[PDB]
Amino acid sequence: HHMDQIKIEENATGFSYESLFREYLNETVTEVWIEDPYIRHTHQLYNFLRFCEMLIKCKVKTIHLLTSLDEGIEQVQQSRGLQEIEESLRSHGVLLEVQYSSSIHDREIRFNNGWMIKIGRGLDYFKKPQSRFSLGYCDFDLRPCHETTVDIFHD
Amino acid sequence: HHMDQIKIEENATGFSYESLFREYLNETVTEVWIEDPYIRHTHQLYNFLRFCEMLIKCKVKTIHLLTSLDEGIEQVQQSRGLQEIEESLRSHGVLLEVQYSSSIHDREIRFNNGWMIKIGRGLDYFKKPQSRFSLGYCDFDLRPCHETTVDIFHD
Ligand SMILES: [Cl-]
Ligand SMILES: [Cl-]
Ligand SMILES: [Cl-]
Ligand SMILES: [Cl-]
Ligand SMILES: [Cl-]
Numbered sequence: 001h002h003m004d005q006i007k008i009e010e011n012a013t014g015f016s017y018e019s020l021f022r023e024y025l026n027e028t029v030t031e032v033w034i035e036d037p038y039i040r041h042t043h044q045l046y047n048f049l050r051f052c053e054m055l056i057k058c059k060v061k062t063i064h065l066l067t068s069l070d071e072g073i074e075q076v077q078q079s080r081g082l083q084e085i086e087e088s089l090r091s092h093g094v095l096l097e098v099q100y101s102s103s104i105h106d107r108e109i110r111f112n113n114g115w116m117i118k119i120g121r122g123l124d125y126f127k128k129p130q131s132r133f134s135l136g137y138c139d140f141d142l143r144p145c146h147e148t149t150v151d152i153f154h155d
Numbered sequence: 156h157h158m159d160q161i162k163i164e165e166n167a168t169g170f171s172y173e174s175l176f177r178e179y180l181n182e183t184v185t186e187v188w189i190e191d192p193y194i195r196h197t198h199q200l201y202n203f204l205r206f207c208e209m210l211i212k213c214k215v216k217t218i219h220l221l222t223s224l225d226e227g228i229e230q231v232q233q234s235r236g237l238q239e240i241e242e243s244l245r246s247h248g249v250l251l252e253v254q255y256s257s258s259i260h261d262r263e264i265r266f267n268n269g270w271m272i273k274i275g276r277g278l279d280y281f282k283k284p285q286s287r288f289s290l291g292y293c294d295f296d297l298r299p300c301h302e303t304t305v306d307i308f309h310d
Contacts, residue, residue, distance in 0.1 A: 045288060053294040084288035092290060133200060133239035135247060138293070139208040 006150035008125060015125070016140035017054050020150070024115035025058070031112040033064045036122040037104045040070040045081040047123040050140070052085060052096070062095045069100040116153035121146060161305035163280060170280070171295035172209050175305065179270035180210070186217045186267035191277040192259050194222040195229055200236040202278040205295070207244060207251070217250045224255045271308035276301060 008015055032055055039048050052063060070078045086096040107122035119125060125148045129137045136142030163170055187210055194203050207218060220237075224230050241251040262277035274280060280303045284292045291297030 046293060049288055049290070050293045053290050053297055056290060057294060057296060081288045084286045085290075088285065088289040091285075130246075131239045131243065133204055133236050134243040135204070135208050135211060138201060138205045139212060141212060142208055 001154050002151065003154050004152040006152070008145050008148045008150060010147040011127070011144040013136070013144060014141050015143075015145050017051050017123070019141055021054065021109075021117070024111055024113070024117065024152070025055075026113065027059055029055075029111045029113050030059055031062045031064075032060055033066075033108075033110040034123075035066045035104065035106050035108040036124075037068045037107070038122055038124055039065065039067040039082070040074040040078045042077065043126075043128075044124055045078065045085075047126075048082075049085055051123055052089060052094075056089070056092050056094055060094060062097070063089065064097045064099070066099050066101060066104060068102055068104055114155040116155070118151040118153065120148045120150075156309050157306065158309050159307040161307070163300050163303045163305060165302040166282070166299040168291070168299060169296050170298075170300050172206050172278070174296055176209065176264075176272065179266055179268070179272065179307070180213060181268065182214060184210075184266045184268050185214055186219075187215055188219045188221075188263075188265040189278075190221045190259060190261055190263040191279075192223040192262075193277055193279050194220065194237070195225040195233045197232070197236070199279050200233065200240070202281075204240055206278055207240060207249075211244070211247055211249060215249065217252070218244065219252045219254070221254045221256060221259060223257060223259060269310040271310070273306040273308065275303045275305075 034048075034051070038044055048065070055063065065082075069075065082098050086098065089096045107119055109117040109119070125145050126140065127144045127146055129143065136144065189203075189206070193199055203220070210218065225233050237253050241253065244251040262274055264272040264274070280300050281295060282299045282301055284298065291299070
């Protein structure tokens with residue numbers, strides 16, 4: 001069932017993952033699935049980390065990530081980054097399962113309460129900060145966004 | 156008036172600035188003063204930025220920072236970073252006033268509503284993250300702390 005459509009306008013703020021996922025996430029959620037072909041660059045690896053921080057801060061014990069393995073220069077940090085996130089989650093009693101596919105195109109987030117969130121840009125919807133010390137560098141509610149569509153579904 | 160003493164134990168979590176300053180910061184606060192000799196290094200400048208993000212997200216219009224200039228070459232990066240924070244604040248309609256003193260030793264945060272918060276380590280009370288991609292790297296509520304005392308005062 002298609003439940004809602006949220007339009008994130010160009011340069012819009014108030015879209016941290018905490019703000020965006022709020023309505024669909026509650027204490028009953030114990031398992032999460034994320035399909036995103038673009039978790040390779042530093043900022044994309046940190047976006048996934050912040051998504052995991054939100055889920056554990058909330059009773060998630062299992063996170064599944066389906067992504068594409070980087071073929072080039074990003075491969076080393078992508079591997080080191082994803083293994084570090086998995087080890088940090090393990091230390092929190094959380095299982096992270098990473099699967100790779102070069103044939104993935106869909107961007108989909110699924111919670112075991114039945115909610116599904118499809119973002120056009122996946123988790124990678126923020127613009128680069130104006131500077132190294134600009135407001136919104138750390139608090140993503142103050143970070144301007146790229147124009148994107150968020151589609152909400154329920155099982 | 157000395158109001159309360161909060162002991163931050165070694166390796167304690169749940170101490171982001173948002174969590175720590177919650178009880179003393181409300182819609183009525185329009186002006187903030189911070190005295191901290193250690194707003195020099197990249198991590199200390201980011202600490203100050205996250206403190207400003209919290210105040211701006213509340214109707215704070217004026218922020219005063221009294222700090223110490225680093226004695227060495229690090230002063231170039233501290234001065235540049237502080238100017239970047241001031242320009243980002245300016246763009247948000249917020250005035251940041253930075254003053255430097257080689258004779259300041261006290262750590263004191265003052266809100267216009269009468270509340271005063273003195274942290275032993277100032278804003279710089281977090282431990283280094285376990286790894287580059289560990290939970291708590293971005294969300295400070297998951298970041299382990301150094302042992303410190305927080306003293307609360309009211310005018
Ligand atoms: Cl976020
Ligand atoms: Cl970023
Ligand atoms: Cl913080
Ligand atoms: Cl009060
Ligand atoms: Cl840090």
